[PDB]
Amino acid sequence: RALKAVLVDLSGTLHIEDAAVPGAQEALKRLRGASVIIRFVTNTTKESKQDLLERLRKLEFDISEDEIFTSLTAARSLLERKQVRPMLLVDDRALPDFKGIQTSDPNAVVMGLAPEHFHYQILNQAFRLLLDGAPLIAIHKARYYKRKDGLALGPGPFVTALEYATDTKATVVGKPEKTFFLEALRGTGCEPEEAVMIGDDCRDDVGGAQDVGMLGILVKTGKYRASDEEKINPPPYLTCESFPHAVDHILQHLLA
Template sequence: MIRGVLLDLAGVVYVGGAALPGAIAAVERLRRAGLPLGFITNTTRSPKREIIARLTAMGLTVADSELTTPAQAARAWLHAMRRAPHLLIHPALAEDFQDLDDYPETAVVVGDAGAGFTYAAMNGAFRALMDGAGFLALARNRTFRDADGALSLDAGGFVAALEYASDRQAVVVGKPSPDFYATAVAGLGVDAADAVMVGDDVEADVSGALSAGLGAAILVRTGKYRDGAEAGAVPPPTAVMADLAEAADWILRNRG
């Protein structure tokens, strides 16, 4: 039975700066049904404040406590491990890393730096890793659906390059990290087995959620979805739907 819902944002609720057709209405239907909602994203080019403002401009009100981001997970890790960040991120995301303690030991934090993925920046991160810095990846997604409608390279390839060069493995704090999903599910106030995830990324959103113990995961054919993406997924999607509106219908039919 479904008692709580986690929704990916980019590619499910919106693409670029525009809401996908029927997406906002679908979210409101789930709210009116009394289902607790959480919103999770691996987007690392925008701070949490800006993501919430973007949703508000689209007509969707989301509370700060309803949105779980990789940056907040990284902050928690840095605090727990007593590390200061060596940031390889988009400049817009820097505000989400303000006011951290200046510990003597560091950790490289890699997000989608966009044009900031220069040789100098990558080499600086590599040298920090070779000197013993911790290694965090906000996410390791392969691609994302860009504002022009085409797929663009995401942070995963750059994380893999640093892993290869340093012979180190990054700790992924965003999706599909089980800890990331556990934090988001805790915000719903339901057991993981009673939660459903809706996303457009079969690896991070679907297989990741199911591996983390969620009871169901729906893959939608919007955003970065490509024909046949679900083939060979382990675990496979509970269901594959055209979009968030159709996924909401499925959820309401299967709610507790």
């Protein structure tokens, strides 16, 4: 084998957050010199690709839109391939990522985190579409997330609500699903066994990736807490102190 692609988590790994991880920018420059394929990945249901992109550029990361693959991109890919018309239960700010997807006579349900749509009447309409055989596509299933005033419900509980109602599993597109990481390499010409994933979240980043054949590097910044390394078996391929260190390891060890 040989290493041809690198998947880099964004939040926790490159920036943490609205401030860059120290060395991150120069480390990414080192990476681009290595002549390796690079894809920046993340779970989001509310930030468009341009939104993330604008933020990364303000932190002086030089990145293309073609290199960013998020759970929204993944949700959009699935829609094009299945040729379906979604009922879009998503934040308005995610809509630019479904530009061009037809919504008339919906025959699919896409769920992200969308408080304005998460109420009885609209959930029951989604339910009634599911009964009719429409698939349920979950951008991801996080239970909760941390906002200014405490933890708040993520999309995961609402998705789980509809699975329970219909007694069926959603198709989950984001991390840690296997299909996420495989979709991330579509168009790269690269197989997962020729790829490494770098992130701060052991289950969602390393666990998920290692499960498709990728090498997983846990970095100890951002969301990482002490001993997170042993929350998976097998353990991570490598546990580094930060993205820069991960990059240094890739250059001196894996790149042939």
